[PDB]
Amino acid sequence: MVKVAILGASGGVGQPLSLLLKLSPYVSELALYDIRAAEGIGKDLSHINTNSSCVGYDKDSIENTLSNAQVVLIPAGVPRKPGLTRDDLFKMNAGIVKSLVTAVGKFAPNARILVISNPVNSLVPIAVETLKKMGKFKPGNVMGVTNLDLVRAETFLVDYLMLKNPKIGQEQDKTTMHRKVTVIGGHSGETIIPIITDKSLVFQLDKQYEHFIHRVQFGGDEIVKAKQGAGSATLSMAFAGAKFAEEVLRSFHNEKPETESLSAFVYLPGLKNGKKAQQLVGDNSIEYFSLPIVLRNGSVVSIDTSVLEKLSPREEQLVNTAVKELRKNIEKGKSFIL
Amino acid sequence: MVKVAILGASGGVGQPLSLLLKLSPYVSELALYDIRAAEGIGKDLSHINTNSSCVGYDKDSIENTLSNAQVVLIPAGVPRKPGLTRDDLFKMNAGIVKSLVTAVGKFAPNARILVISNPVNSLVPIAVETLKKMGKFKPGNVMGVTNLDLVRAETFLVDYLMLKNPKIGQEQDKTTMHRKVTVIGGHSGETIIPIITDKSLVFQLDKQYEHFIHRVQFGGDEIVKAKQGAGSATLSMAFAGAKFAEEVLRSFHNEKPETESLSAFVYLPGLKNGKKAQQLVGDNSIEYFSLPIVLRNGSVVSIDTSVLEKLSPREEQLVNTAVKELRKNIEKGKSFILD
Ligand SMILES: NC(=O)c1ccc[n+]([C@@H]2O[C@H](COP(=O)([O-])OP(=O)(O)OC[C@H]3O[C@@H](n4cnc5c(N)ncnc54)[C@H](O)[C@@H]3O)[C@@H](O)[C@H]2O)c1
Numbered sequence A: 001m002v003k004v005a006i007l008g009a010s011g012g013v014g015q016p017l018s019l020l021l022k023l024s025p026y027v028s029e030l031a032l033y034d035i036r037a038a039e040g041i042g043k044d045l046s047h048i049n050t051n052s053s054c055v056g057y058d059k060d061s062i063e064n065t066l067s068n069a070q071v072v073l074i075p076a077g078v079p080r081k082p083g084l085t086r087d088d089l090f091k092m093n094a095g096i097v098k099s100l101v102t103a104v105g106k107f108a109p110n111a112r113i114l115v116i117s118n119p120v121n122s123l124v125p126i127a128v129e130t131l132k133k134m135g136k137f138k139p140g141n142v143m144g145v146t147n148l149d150l151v152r153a154e155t156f157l158v159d160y161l162m163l164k165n166p167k168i169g170q171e172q173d174k175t176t177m178h179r180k181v182t183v184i185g186g187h188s189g190e191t192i193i194p195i196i197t198d199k200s201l202v203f204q205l206d207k208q209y210e211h212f213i214h215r216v217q218f219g220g221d222e223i224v225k226a227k228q229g230a231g232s233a234t235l236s237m238a239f240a241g242a243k244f245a246e247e248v249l250r251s252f253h254n255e256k257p258e259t260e261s262l263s264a265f266v267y268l269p270g271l272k273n274g275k276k277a278q279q280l281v282g283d284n285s286i287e288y289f290s291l292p293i294v295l296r297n298g299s300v301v302s303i304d305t306s307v308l309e310k311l312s313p314r315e316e317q318l319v320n321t322a323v324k325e326l327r328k329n330i331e332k333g334k335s336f337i338l
Numbered sequence B: 001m002v003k004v005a006i007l008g009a010s011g012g013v014g015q016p017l018s019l020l021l022k023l024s025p026y027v028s029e030l031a032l033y034d035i036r037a038a039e040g041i042g043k044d045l046s047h048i049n050t051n052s053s054c055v056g057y058d059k060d061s062i063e064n065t066l067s068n069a070q071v072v073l074i075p076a077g078v079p080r081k082p083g084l085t086r087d088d089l090f091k092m093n094a095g096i097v098k099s100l101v102t103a104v105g106k107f108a109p110n111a112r113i114l115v116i117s118n119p120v121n122s123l124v125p126i127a128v129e130t131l132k133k134m135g136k137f138k139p140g141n142v143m144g145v146t147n148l149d150l151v152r153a154e155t156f157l158v159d160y161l162m163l164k165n166p167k168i169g170q171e172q173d174k175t176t177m178h179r180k181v182t183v184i185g186g187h188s189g190e191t192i193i194p195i196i197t198d199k200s201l202v203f204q205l206d207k208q209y210e211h212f213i214h215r216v217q218f219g220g221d222e223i224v225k226a227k228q229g230a231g232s233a234t235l236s237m238a239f240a241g242a243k244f245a246e247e248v249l250r251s252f253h254n255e256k257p258e259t260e261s262l263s264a265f266v267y268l269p270g271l272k273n274g275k276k277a278q279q280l281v282g283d284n285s286i287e288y289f290s291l292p293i294v295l296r297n298g299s300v301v302s303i304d305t306s307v308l309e310k311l312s313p314r315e316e317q318l319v320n321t322a323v324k325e326l327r328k329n330i331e332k333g334k335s336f337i338l339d
């Protein structure tokens, strides 16, 4: 059935991501690539008694890694650290994503590409425009992994209900809260739009609602601070990213997604209902948004816009703020490569 | 239901181990402790949408880490390195285990203590002899985690079958192969004893038997070599360690273990059928061996000796060489405390 490659497998995200993917029953080969250390990490994980073969490859061996792959996860990139501006991160990461995605376009042009590298809002456009340049772009096959934002929302909605109201918070199970909240937009504090779909819950949060919003939005900053400068979220990204990959993998075996309204940052003009999404977010030419997606054989075949149809006034304002930032993020991406 | 603490949570083994423990439905509170970085790693994991509450703690907060902990995982240690002698490696890890186990004795004396630190064969006797001296030693509660040996055995059994007979290789599920192989003894190449139960797997293996047996025993080395001196097994360890802790945690909630003949390195004299095990291994005073255990409520209540009762002439030969070296491993640990 399905070969997964992981480009950037040896990093803080990449190792535990590789570990979690070795545990997936949907994977048949697992290939790990990095500029260093991947062969040892693959060997390490090949001892695990799950059915997948796991090989890591050296820095000169991206082709062996990619050849025949159906899904390509990209945790490669440079993470936030104290000596580094957003613009530093943007340019270094843009080079990485370009080379790795050019490698995909040459060695496995049909694979579903799941981009973890940050800034997702501008690097996804880099991915797409690189593939378009190559004549290799399939819009269903390029996904910005924004699912860590959904993981946080689920977690924080329970943690904020516990605080306000130990009554209601008892009955909440963090593992199933995706029934009650959906995250859309982009992946930065200006662009993350948490949409509580259970309107009762919005009211029960009361004055903790605005804190909840802010917490989901700035979760990235929170871990950077916790890790005392040197480090960003790694382990929980690995988790979120493997969860998303597992939905993409499910969809090769004709199975229902476990997350209701699973979102990824996708190219609206190439996907069904993208034009309706554009209108619904108030901007007729915006090219990318993180929105709930429908998967078949690991490709996005439609966008489900339901969550855009019942926005509160407050949420409309979050959308508006997101759109204006996103337009700039996208343009910075496209123009770095055009 | 249960509070879990991880001492050494920021290391190569500890971070992935902590992530897997965050995903356990059996855990109420997950507490992480290291000489460095454990607070950020706890915060990172706290964002994961599973029900456990995860908090990390600085080097001076082992007190709050251990308070009400019922299960303590110890991945803290120094791993193998291109530089280090056997004896210098031992010295460093001995101090770390004595020190962390003392704190357990002081702040969570009832906890089930799961020792991942290596050398397991000597570090588990150090934890016991530390606890005895404090008057806080319960034999059911100290377990050297040897589960990675089982994991490799399961996996190399299939890898080796494939290359011999693909018809049968392909028939196997790497994941449930703890019904067809059980590992006993110690955790080192001289002490690991893979008992292929289901015998006709041994004849298909043919001259790949001695090759397989050796692959399992020297798994650690293989990773050290594959990581080109700079690290040992981490992620597979976190996996094998987390599975093992899961069986421990599972036994708190009236559930059968998922792993048949689940082994761990335990103190024979303090344990039901421990005497029977010593006889069956051909050493009446050997105080430690990794053997299938029965867990009631986190604690080892008996040793199941079945697996020693029926042994090939080759398997008794493996028991023999393991016991000789284990005596020295156990003495090397006991004397570190009994000095
Ligand atoms: N999408 C999200 O929600 C989210 C969350 C957390 C982190 N991130 C991002 O994920 C990325 C990785 O973070 P980390 O903490 O794992 O960083 P890291 O520096 O620990 O690891 C990145 C890895 O990428 C590898 N790499 C670099 N260039 C490469 C190339 N050309 N080919 C293959 N591999 C290469 C490095 O060797 C390293 O092993 C960062 O860009 C970070 O901003 C995204």
Ligand SMILES: NC(=O)c1ccc[n+]([C@@H]2O[C@H](COP(=O)([O-])OP(=O)(O)OC[C@H]3O[C@@H](n4cnc5c(N)ncnc54)[C@H](O)[C@@H]3O)[C@@H](O)[C@H]2O)c1
Binding pocket: B007, B008, B009, B010, B011, B012, B013, B014, B033, B034, B035, B036, B075, B076, B077, B078, B079, B080, B093, B096, B099, B100, B115, B116, B117, B118, B119, B120, B145, B146, B148, B149, B187, B232, B233, B234, B237
């Ligand atoms: N049982 C097994 O089968 C098995 C398998 C693999 C590794 N190991 C062993 O596990 C240990 C960990 O290896 P690793 O690769 O994670 O090493 P590492 O060096 O990556 O991790 C060691 C961690 O232990 C911490 N530590 C040291 N002293 C401490 C103390 N007093 N209190 C709290 N934390 C402390 C360090 O700060 C670090 O975060 C080693 O001894 C290694 O050989 C055992």
Ligand SMILES: O=C([O-])CC(=O)C(=O)O
Binding pocket: A079, A080, A118, A148, A219, A220, A221, A223, A224, A232, A233
């Ligand atoms: O904040 C960062 O740089 C990494 C990230 O995307 C996150 O944790 O959300």
Ligand SMILES: O=C([O-])CC(=O)C(=O)O
Binding pocket: B079, B080, B118, B148, B219, B220, B221, B223, B224, B232, B233
């Ligand atoms: O070999 C080492 O040094 C670490 C270990 O215990 C293993 O991988 O089995």
